[PDB]
Amino acid sequence: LKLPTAPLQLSGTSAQIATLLWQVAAKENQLDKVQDELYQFIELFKQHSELRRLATDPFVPTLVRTKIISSVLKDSGASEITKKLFEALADEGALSALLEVTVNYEELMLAHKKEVYCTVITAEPLDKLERVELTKKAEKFVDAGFKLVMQEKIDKKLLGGFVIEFSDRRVDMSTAKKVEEFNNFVNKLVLSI
């Protein structure tokens, strides 16, 4: 009667599908099994046209929607957690709800691994010492014993330094911001003096 606890809460009626999906698959310990199975359906929704007609056509009746999905979903290695899921979305026309339920299941899976994104922008590419001096200030800016990925990036307008685009937080140690804030502390003291 107990479900495995969701690592972070979400919004409703389109993303808590993924919260419920994570609460089912982690009970079956099928976590990285079914997550890239959602990816294949997106490639099925990308390349093939007959399946992606079924996710947006408003004229197909409510029995051809389920009798193609359960016809396509034989065993084939596919999980019955996944097979009972994709039956349910074509049961109530929710086959358009796939591209949202994945990216929050992506978020919830990266919430199960303690594994946060970032994107660091410099003016200079990072060598094998410059990148390993970066993380020791970056891991002051995560809250706990988390992981860290790297998405190194080049832009000329920053004059050295970095900006850690956590997508939730940002730390500006770039000098182009520093010379801007140096100029604002010039003007706030030359006008007052």
């Binding site: 419920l20 929704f45 390349q47 947006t56 049961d91 109530e92 591209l99």
Partner: peptide, 29 residues
């Protein structure tokens, strides 16, 4: 190209999560 119509959720039946939950727990062994 072929995923611009899939970019957002769209459905009827605002109580959809309660519908799918009874169709996700059966395959729980």
């Amino acid at each position: 190209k072929a995923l611009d119509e899939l970019r957002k959720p769209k459905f009827s039946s605002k109580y959809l999560i309660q519908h799918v939950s009874q169709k996700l727990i059966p395959a729980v062994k």
